[PDB]
A paper describes a structure:
Fcho1 and Fcho2 likely play a key role in local AP-2 restructuring, as they are among the earliest proteins to mark a nascent CCS (Henne et al., 2010, Taylor et al., 2011) and affect AP-2 conformation directly (Hollopeter et al., 2014, Umasankar et al., 2014). But what makes Fchos unusual is that the C-terminal SH3 domain typical of most EFC-domain proteins is replaced by a μ-homology domain (μHD), distantly related in primary sequence to cargo-selective μ subunits of the heterotetrameric clathrin adaptors such as AP-2 (Reider et al., 2009). The μHD of all three (designated the muniscins) binds directly to the pioneer protein Eps15 (Henne et al., 2010, Reider et al., 2009, Uezu et al., 2007, Umasankar et al., 2012). The structure of an Eps15/R⋅Fcho1 μ-homology domain complex reveals a spacing-dependent DPF triad, bound in a mechanistically distinct way from the mode of single DPF binding to AP-2.
A fusion of EPS15 (designated ET615-EG637) to the zebrafish Fcho1 μHD (residues 867–1,152) with a GAGA spacer crystallized and diffracted to 2.4 Å. In the final structure, excellent-quality electron density is visible for residues EF620-EG637 of EPS15 and P874-L1152 of the μHD. There is no evidence of the spacer residues separating the EPS15 and μHD sections, but distance constraints make it highly likely that the interaction is intramolecular. Like other μ subunits, the Fcho1 μHD contains 18 β strands arranged as two intercalated β-sandwich subdomains, the fold being comparable with the orthologous Saccharomyces cerevisiae Syp1p μHD (Reider et al., 2009) and μ1–μ4. Yet the Fcho1 μHD also contains three additional α helices in subdomain A, and the concave face of the Fcho1 μHD is considerably more curved than other μHDs. The EPS15 segment binds in a spiral trough that runs halfway around the long axis of subdomain A, with the Fcho μHD-unique α helices forming a considerable part of the trough. The trough is lined with conserved largely hydrophobic residues, and significant contacts with the protein are only through the three DPF motif side chains of the sequence 623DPFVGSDPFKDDPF; the interaction buries 1,640 Å2 of solvent-accessible area. The electron density indicates well-ordered DPFs; the first two adopt type I tight turn conformations stabilized by intramolecular H bonding between the Asp residue side chains and the backbone amide of the +2-position Phe residues. In the last DPF, the side chain of ED634 additionally forms a salt bridge with R1133. Thus the structure strongly suggests that the short tri- (VGS) or di- (KD) residue spacing between tandem DPFs is important to allow three to simultaneously dock onto a single Fcho1 subdomain A with a 1:1 stoichiometry.
Residue numbers in the entry:
A (entry chain E): 620 to 637
B (entry chain A): 877 to 1100, 1104 to 1151
The structure:
């Protein structure tokens, strides 16, 4: 349980944005 | 074109739970949950924000918050309505100028990152009702002469627990290195660094009786304080313990994801 809740795993990696 | 498309953000709800089951006659308990709400922004949304100081207002709502005792919003970045009396819901608006500056600094600080996290809220929930604890513990202790016996019943309950598994489940009973004639059902390891008995438990689920409940015990002899206490550790994902949730208000932004995780802090069963 590190301070980055997304644990270095980009939550937007698969998002169609951009 | 980036200007007109709906922009994604992501939220993370993190909760720690401390609990104490006193044991004895009534086995009364105390529960304290401490939570954190973080929001994540995609790196490319800075260039949008810096370029447009008039960028539309990111707004969100907390829901199912009746179980939360206290809130500490981030007052650097957020607005709210003190005249909003709704007990189960509360609204917050971002200050888009402060938010823009905040992400600009985050980017400047870490140009390599593909996202930037922002801390929205801290909160707390306390109860003496065991119904708030996902895992019910009852410990008992008996001593005849030099022999001490300790037993623990655990119950993962549908009335108590969120809908998800408890994983990385461990049960810790501290025991000194002077103890002899060790018996454990089921078997346990003795960690010499910390001086404690370790049980590793299978994942627990409220869905099934056989999957969710159990018992364990240990006994030893000591040639020679208070009754020993057992500590339980576990982790979960996909639900919150408090019940709190977050949803966006308005269609201009959309929530890419909401990550929910919880873990035990000090989570204890004492025996009389
Ligand atoms: Zn039950």
């Amino acid at each position: 349980f590190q301070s980055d809740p997304f644990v270095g795993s980009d939550p937007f990696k698969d998002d169609p944005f951009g | 074109l980036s200007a007109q498309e709906s922009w994604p953000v992501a939220a993370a709800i993190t909760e720690y739970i401390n609990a104490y089951f006193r044991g004895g006659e009534h086995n009364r308990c105390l529960v304290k949950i401490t939570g954190d709400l973080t929001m994540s922004f995609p790196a490319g949304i800075t260039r949008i924000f810096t370029a447009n100081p008039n960028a539309p207002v990111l707004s969100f709502r907390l829901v199912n918050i009746s179980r939360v005792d206290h809130f500490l919003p981030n007052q650097k970045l957020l607005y709210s309505d003190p005249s909003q009396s709704d007990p189960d819901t509360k609204d917050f608006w971002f200050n888009m100028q402060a938010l823009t500056l905040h992400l600009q600094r985050e980017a400047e600080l870490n140009p390599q990152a593909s996202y930037y996290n922002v801390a929205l809220l801290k909160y707390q929930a306390s109860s003496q009702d065991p119904s708030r604890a996902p895992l019910l513990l009852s410990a008992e202790c008996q001593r005849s002469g030099t022999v001490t016996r300790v037993s623990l019943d655990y119950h993962c309950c549908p009335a108590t627990a969120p809908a998800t598994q408890l994983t990385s489940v461990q049960v810790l009973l501290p025991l000194d290195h002077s103890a002899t004639d060790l018996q454990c059902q089921p078997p346990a390891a003795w960690n010499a660094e910390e001086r404690r008995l370790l049980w590793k438990l299978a994942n627990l689920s409220p869905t099934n009786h056989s999957k969710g409940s159990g018992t364990l015990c240990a006994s030893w002899q000591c040639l020679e304080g208070p009754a020993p206490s057992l500590a339980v550790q576990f982790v979960g994902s996909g639900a919150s313990l408090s019940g709190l949730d977050v949803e966006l208000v308005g269609s201009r932004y959309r929530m890419s994801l909401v990550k929910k995780r919880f873990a035990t802090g000090k989570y204890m069963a004492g025996c009389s």
